[PDB]
Amino acid sequence: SVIKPDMKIKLRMEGAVNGHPFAIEGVGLGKPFEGKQSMDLKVKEGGPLPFAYDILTMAFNRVFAKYPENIVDYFKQSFPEGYSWERSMIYEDGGICNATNDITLDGDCYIYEIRFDGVNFPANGPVMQKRTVKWELSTEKLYVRDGVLKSDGNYALSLEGGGHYRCDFKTTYKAKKVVQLPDYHSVDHHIEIKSHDKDYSNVNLHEHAEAHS
């Protein structure tokens, strides 16, 4: 009763990569029951970003995922109160990122408060040399542990001049109130930077996601 087929998004991220701080604001919209969303992002501080934008895009809400009726939807169920997530991302060359998102709802607009922190990206690596092209299709595996929803993913970025750069994702999801918990299941994800200006100050970003089992 606090969800519509068309919902709005606004967000702010504050973060640092290798000790250098930045900040990004976004506005978007999406279709929760279609598992589709899009947003425009602006770098407000720390620009132009000296690292690959791609490490940020998955930080920029599982509410935007199409759930079939026979799988519990932990995310749509958690509103109006909302929910939060915590996440670690371990890249194969030792770069490690953490992030958190606190998601609230005002009227028809989800609101994000995001923190992102990466360390140990080698100067000669694909992230600091901006050699990433795109994330391949992702499959997120969701399970319950000690009363809370968690997920795992083995994600991969395509690189310039071929090959892939791997990252292991671990996320914890927590509803603000008590919510019916799902059984084990998968979510397929497609995420894409559809357009950006030269230095990525402006980015138009899309995702589509569907649950299955």
DSSP string for residues in 184-195: SEEEEEEEEEEE
DSSP assignment, residue 197? Answer: -
Cα–Cα distance for residue pair 60/37, rounded to 1 Å = 11
Identity of the amino acid at 107: G
Taking the CB of residue 180, how many other CB atoms lie within 10 A of it? 9
Structure tokens at 42: 């602006």
**Nearest to 41, CA basis, from 112, 142, 124, 123:** 112
Cα–Cα distance for residue pair 8/107, rounded to 1 Å = 9
Q: Find where tokens 């809370």 sit.
A: 148
The neighbouring-strand residues paired with 208 are 36, 190
Q: Is 190 marked as a binding-site residue?
A: no
Cα dist. 123→17, 130, 139 in Å?
12, 10, 29
Structural contact between residues 32 and 64, judged by C-beta atoms closer than 8 angstroms: yes
Per DSSP bridges, beta strands 109-119 and 7-17 are parallel
Cα–Cα distance for residue pair 171/150, rounded to 1 Å = 6
Cα–Cα distance for residue pair 158/96, rounded to 1 Å = 18
Does an H or E element contain 76, and which? helix 74-77
Structural contact between residues 154 and 166, judged by C-beta atoms closer than 8 angstroms: yes
**Nearest to 49, CA basis, from 106, 109, 116, 110:** 116
Cα–Cα distance for residue pair 28/81, rounded to 1 Å = 20
Cα–Cα distance for residue pair 95/90, rounded to 1 Å = 6
Does an H or E element contain 86, and which? strand 83-91
Taking the CB of residue 186, how many other CB atoms lie within 10 A of it? 15
Structural contact between residues 59 and 30, judged by C-beta atoms closer than 8 angstroms: no
Cα–Cα distance for residue pair 175/132, rounded to 1 Å = 33
Cα–Cα distance for residue pair 42/58, rounded to 1 Å = 16
Based on the number of CB atoms within 10 Å of its own CB, is 70 exposed (0-12), middle (13-18) or buried (19 or more)?
exposed
Q: Is 164 marked as a binding-site residue?
A: no
Cα–Cα distance for residue pair 64/73, rounded to 1 Å = 11
Structure tokens at 168: 């292991």
Based on the number of CB atoms within 10 Å of its own CB, is 25 exposed (0-12), middle (13-18) or buried (19 or more)?
middle
Domains of the chain (ranges plus CATH)?
A: 1-213 (2.40.155.10)
**Nearest to 12, CA basis, from 26, 32, 30:** 26
DSSP assignment, residue 136? Answer: P
